[PDB]
């Protein structure tokens, strides 16, 4: 039985400008006291055509973790647009929240993220090179994909 169980994720401050940080409120239960910290990450998929464009937006070691219910508001800065292929900037991509224990990933929460212009002129005639200061990020919060993995908890 997994020592940590994620019960809920709430997507905060959504929709928002592309440049605003991601914000998630995570609720989890610890079945027993952990001897090591929990490593939380937020990973942005810069390109659905290649994993080489993944950006680790944030990484945070949280501990010691006692038994019981816990809540955590995690913020990560927006991805660096200089690393995103222009063809992937406008449209749907993915953002992931992962948790790792002793080097082993035990949970992944994924969301589709829709990046679009809000001005009608820009939506119909998008600039040749994307203007990230005019893009609105809309996380599809009602459709999280939750995947759990079997790991050695000791």
């Amino acid at each position: 039985m997994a020592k940590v169980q994620v019960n809920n994720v709430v997507v905060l401050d959504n929709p928002s400008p592309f440049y605003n940080p991601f914000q998630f409120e995570i609720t989890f239960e610890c079945i027993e006291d952990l001897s090591e910290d929990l490593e939380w990450k937020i990973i942005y998929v810069g390109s659905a055509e290649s994993e080489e464009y993944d950006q680790v937006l944030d990484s945070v070691l949280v501990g010691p973790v006692p038994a019981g219910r816990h809540m955590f508001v995690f913020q990560a800065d927006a991805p660096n647009p200089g690393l995103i292929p222009d063809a992937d900037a406008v449209g749907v991509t993915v953002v992931l929240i992962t948790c790792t224990y002793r080097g082993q990933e035990f949970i992944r929460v994924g969301y589709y993220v829709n990046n679009e212009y809000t001005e009608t002129e820009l939506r119909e005639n998008p600039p040749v090179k994307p203007d990230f200061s005019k893009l609105q990020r809309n996380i599809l919060a009602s459709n999280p994909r939750v995947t759990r993995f079997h790991i050695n908890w000791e």
């Binding site: 998929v45 659905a48 994993e51 749907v92 993915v94 992931l96 994924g110 969301y111 994909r145």
Partner: peptide, 9 residues
């Protein structure tokens, strides 16, 4: 595509 990596999420 349902069978392509739009399932990295």
């Amino acid at each position: 595509e349902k069978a392509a990596x739009x399932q990295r999420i």
